[PDB]
Symmetry: C11
Subunit: 69 residues, 11 copies
């Protein structure tokens, strides 16, 4: 039942990086998206923070935001 | 528990479920032909969903479109 | 207490297909609706995704969408 | 639990409960004559409901009509 | 747990409760005469409610009328 | 737990509690005279309420009026 | 739990609590003089509240007025 | 758990807690002088609150004013 | 759990927490000077809050203003 | 669980966490330079937060501004 | 559990997590370069978040901007 974010890649090679939940913080996975693909990604037991690199249109419960490459 | 609506706008749209857990990889790909709709939840096994191909998508945060 | 989807068949032979919950994903049931019949179907312990094939008017909590045969 | 309102607009409308669980089959059909209303929940035993015949239906997602 | 409001618009209206559980049958029918109102929950014993006769009904999903 | 508000619009209005459970019968009838208000919950013992006599009624679903 | 606000519009208004349980009787009668306000919950002991006398009442369902 | 806001509009306003439980009696009377504000919850010990004297009151159901 | 916002509008404002339980008395008085904001919850130990002095107050029920002696 | 946002409008804004429990004193002070933002929850150890210095503050009840 | 969205408006923005509990200290500083977006929860380990550097911030209370150094 956690929140989720919507990431639409606006160019090739966007990275959606999950950061580890817990006392330690590191990248545990980078999902690479190509232009026009959409990832819908939850917060989870393993992921408590999500970093987006590259150009993407993003939706979350607080509205739209855009990352730039 | 949340769900995503996916409407295929062309043949071969691929809805890809990513594994929940410490590891991340795809565990299922459900292909849709033009005009079919898939309403898919997040689950004990799927904590992220990727859409490839042209599709019209509804989530609780609104509509979004994937481009194939 | 789970969410549900309303499906109204707009032609004969519409299939509402339930996909299994869990590590295994497959179709476990396909409900045939003929024109003008309505099915209101929940997500369940056994059904964690629902596929609609054929021409149908669908309502979810996200709004209306239409499937095309 | 959510519920659905079905108002029959002709005689012989059927409101059909489908079994919860790994098996899916009809376990009951409640027949409604014109102008009767049935207000029916989802339950431990009923995880999908089908309506046949002409009726005005309300759910949390709005009005829909079934046609015979 | 949710409830239904029924107002009888004529004499003889029946508000009928249907059993929760694997089996479905009527376990009670409450008769309403014209102008009487019943407010009735879903319960451990009642998972579906049928209205027969002319009445004004309100639920969480808005108004509907039986005839 | 939900409640209903009843304002008596004439003397002798009866607000009648129906028993929760396998059995359905009246366990109590509260008499209201004109201009009296009763605000009454659903409870462990009361799972349906009946109003007889002229009254103004509010619930979560809005206003309704019973007639004598 | 839900609560009701009652403002006495004249002297000697009674806000009466009815017992929760199989039995229904008055357990307490709170007298309000003109202009006093009582804000009163539903509780383990009180599952219905009756107002006698002229008062302005607010509940989650909106305003209603009891009259002498 | 809810609360009520009381602003005293003159000296000596009393905000009175009534005991939760089978018994209903006062328990505490908080004196507010003019312009003072008390913001008071419903609690394990208090299930009803009376205001005596001139005050501006806010609850989840809106504004109401007591008069001395 | 709910909280109240209090902004002091002059020096020497007191936000007083009253004890939760059968006993009612002041257990703490937090002094605020002009311009300072206190955001205070209701808690295991505080079930009523009194404000003495001129202050601008927000709660879930809206704005109210205390006036000093 | 609730949180406040604090934006420092000058150097040396002081966000002060008060200890949760029978005792009240501050257990941590986080200073912000001009333009920095702190987003801080109510927690097991913090049940009141004081802001000293010029800051722009958002909470669930709207915007408020501390002045130094 | 709540999250905040942070979009860096210049290079070198820091998103800093403060420890939950009786002890308060920084336990992690996530550097964002311009145009990158971080969506970060409150967690069992982070009960406050500080942003330093020019960034556009969304929370459930709306938009706020941090201003750089
Ligand atoms: N296996 C990952 C999948 C995931 C969810 N959200 C993510 C965000 C970024 C990267 C991976 C993910 C997890 O359960 O946490
Ligand atoms: N058996 C899968 C089915 C599923 C649900 N949502 C999905 C999204 C993509 C692919 C598969 C799925 C599950 O329970 O997780
Ligand atoms: N027996 C199935 C019935 C069902 C509910 N929703 C569905 C959607 C599609 C197909 C079947 C169903 C279940 O409980 O899961
Ligand atoms: N005994 C059935 C009654 C029922 C509830 N909702 C229904 C919908 C359709 C048909 C029967 C029902 C059950 O509890 O599940
Ligand atoms: N002793 C009754 C009181 C009651 C509550 N709601 C009612 C409606 C009608 C008649 C009595 C009541 C009970 O707890 O159920
Ligand atoms: N004893 C019944 C009373 C009841 C509640 N709602 C109803 C609807 C119809 C008939 C009876 C009822 C029950 O608790 O279930
Ligand atoms: N010790 C009292 C404090 C209190 C809260 N609400 C009140 C209203 C009126 C009087 C006192 C109170 C209690 O916890 O109940
Ligand atoms: N001691 C009573 C106090 C009360 C609350 N609400 C009331 C309404 C009317 C009369 C008394 C009360 C109780 O806990 O139930
Ligand atoms: N130690 C106090 C801190 C506090 C919270 N809210 C208050 C209101 C007024 C005075 C003190 C407080 C408590 O946990 O209760
Ligand atoms: N491992 C950290 C990750 C994190 C979440 N939100 C943060 C905010 C700032 C810094 C780190 C984080 C945690 O679970 O708490
Ligand atoms: N360790 C502190 C961190 C904190 C959260 N909110 C605060 C507000 C002010 C000062 C410190 C804090 C705690 O978890 O409580």
């Amino acid at each position: 039942n956690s929140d989720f974010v919507v990431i639409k890649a606006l160019e090739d090679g966007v990275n959606v990086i999950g950061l580890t939940r817990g006392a330690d913080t590191r990248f545990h996975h980078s999902e690479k998206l190509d232009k026009g693909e959409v990832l819908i990604a939850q917060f989870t037991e393993h992921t408590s923070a999500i970093k987006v690199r590259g150009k993407a249109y993003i939706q979350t419960r607080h509205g739209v935001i855009e990352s730039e490459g």
